[PDB]
Amino acid sequence: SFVVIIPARYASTRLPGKPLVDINGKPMIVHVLERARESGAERIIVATDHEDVARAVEAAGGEVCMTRADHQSGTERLAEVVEKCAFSDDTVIVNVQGDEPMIPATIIRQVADNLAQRQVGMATLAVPIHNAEEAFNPNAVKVVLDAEGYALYFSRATIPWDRDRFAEGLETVGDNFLRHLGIYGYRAGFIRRYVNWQPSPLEHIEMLEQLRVLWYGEKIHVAVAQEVPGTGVDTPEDLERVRAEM
Amino acid sequence: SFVVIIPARYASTRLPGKPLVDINGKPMIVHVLERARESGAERIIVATDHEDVARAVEAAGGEVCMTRADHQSGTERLAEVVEKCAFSDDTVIVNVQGDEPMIPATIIRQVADNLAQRQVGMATLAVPIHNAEEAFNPNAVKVVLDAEGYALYFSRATIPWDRDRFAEGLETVGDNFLRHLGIYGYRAGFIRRYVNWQPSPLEHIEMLEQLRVLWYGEKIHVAVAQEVPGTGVDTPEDLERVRAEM
Ligand SMILES: Nc1ccn([C@@H]2O[C@H](COP(=O)(O)OP(=O)(O)OP(=O)(O)O)[C@@H](O)[C@H]2O)c(=O)n1
Ligand SMILES: Nc1ccn([C@@H]2O[C@H](COP(=O)(O)OP(=O)(O)OP(=O)(O)O)[C@@H](O)[C@H]2O)c(=O)n1
Ligand SMILES: [Mg+2]
Ligand SMILES: [Mg+2]
């Protein structure tokens, strides 16, 4: 009932060659592949631009689609896979980012289901932040929601800003921050629409691909899950933490 | 063609008693009144909760409406004024905040005009920030817009966050920052709608009354003016600056 595509370019800047970094005997990309398998997805494809990533995935028995080196985000890379596989417009695609080796299968299913149950073009998920270090870390993307759960904005800045608390000091946070997880649900037809839009100025400043959608006035629904152990892997520090936790 | 209402409660927390602070021989509230007069507004009302504010305005020949002490924002206070004056729903109201003694008359007129020409419930304005101090100052409210100029979010946080520039240092900013001005255009019918909503959690965290509107899924249009003098008076530092510049 849904397809998972995992975008995994080699030349990440904050952690070069990250799809292939070892985590307890397997490259990160293979761990993400396993989360996708566990979700029950009908088809799972790794999209990459690098032969060494392709070989690792093929050796783990996963399907691979080679894609252009000049894509500027995972979602842009997905559109090439979508065109090559010729998915119907109504086919549900879940982008599980190659930097999320600990994302639970249940969360993958939840995003697909949430998307299919709403007339929204794109669905995603966030989890509460419980410590101030993460609230003030620009590598942890924060998201602020409206009353219906649609995203107002995603940012690397600390939003929503707590005026009175932070005027005092920056060492504590209340119970109102949300960390955005690297996963998106969207139908193939929406992915097509996404790459047909001209890039927003906003997405390039924050380096957050989802801002293109908000810029063109479309909604993103964000479900909130209370507990999800682990973290995405964007820095050397993230990698050490994940190595220890898995 | 429009009514100006200036909300001015006495007990500000960041600058106590600010409607009465001396700015070069006249209290701040009287300067705001003078800006409102210059706009050509058909009627101008200062809404206050304090007799000494009332007296300063009356001594300057201005109209005063006493209002409850328990209002939690200028917009809430304006609703009491709208009922007491029994304005019709379609009456165009411009909230010129009591902390904007330097706001140009042209900007006041522009917000009223923008509101009237659009199907939108609420209109406001922002000005490009070209210095790093204001961009990183939580007393300067930043806003990020969509392609059509509707607000995605308003925040005291530094948005949009420049990932690559700021990873290096906070010394400089690009050209992508907008400072929100303390002026709102809305019809009386919208003000009535605003206070029919239960308060949002979001507005209390940021201490930004306009966030109630985004929380409940309604739009705010933001015009951008390229050049606007002065600043909002919220801190002692702002007060020194406006005293030097007015
Ligand atoms: N041009 C890009 C950038 C990102 N991705 C993929 O999208 C996912 C999420 O992006 P991110 O974690 O930020 O990866 P990078 O962009 O590669 O890393 P960095 O931002 O540090 O440069 C990653 O699996 C990455 O491989 C992609 O396919 N093409
Ligand atoms: N409960 C409130 C708070 C604000 N205002 C008015 O709304 C305008 C903008 O608010 P702000 O500049 O923040 O004033 P204060 O809320 O009074 O100051 P502070 O946030 O420092 O406590 C001001 O003219 C203020 O008098 C109001 O009428 N009632
Ligand atoms: Mg990236
Ligand atoms: Mg205030």
Curated annotation (Swiss-Prot), chains A, B:
- Look up the EC number in the record and give it: 2.7.7.38
Q: Cofactors per UniProt?
A: Mg(2+)
Name the pathway it acts in.
Answer: Nucleotide-sugar biosynthesis; CMP-3-deoxy-D-manno-octulosonate biosynthesis; CMP-3-deoxy-D-manno-octulosonate from 3-deoxy-D-manno-octulosonate and CTP: step 1/1; Bacterial outer membrane biogenesis; lipopolysaccharide biosynthesis
Per UniProt, which keywords does this protein have?
Answer: Cytoplasm, Lipopolysaccharide biosynthesis, Magnesium, Nucleotidyltransferase, Transferase
What GO CC annotations are associated with the protein?
cytosol
Please verify whether the record's keywords include Cell inner membrane: no
The main place the protein resides is cytoplasm
What Gene Ontology molecular function terms does this protein carry?
A: 3-deoxy-manno-octulosonate cytidylyltransferase activity; magnesium ion binding
The cross-references to Pfam families, in alphabetical order and at most eight, read: CTP_transf_3 (PF02348)
Which reaction is catalysed here?
A: 3-deoxy-alpha-D-manno-oct-2-ulosonate + CTP = CMP-3-deoxy-beta-D-manno-octulosonate + diphosphate
| UniProt subcellular location | Cytoplasm
Query: Does the keyword Lipid metabolism belong to this entry?
Result: no
GO BP terms: namely: CMP-keto-3-deoxy-D-manno-octulosonic acid biosynthetic process; keto-3-deoxy-D-manno-octulosonic acid biosynthetic process
Top enzyme class, one word, equals: transferase
| Annotated NCBIfam families | kdsB, PRK05450.1-3, PRK05450.1-5, PRK13368.1
Q: Which family does it belong to?
A: Belongs to the KdsB family.
Its function, per the record, reads: Activates KDO (a required 8-carbon sugar) for incorporation into bacterial lipopolysaccharide in Gram-negative bacteria.
Q: What is this protein called?
A: 3-deoxy-manno-octulosonate cytidylyltransferase
Gene name, Swiss-Prot/TrEMBL: kdsB
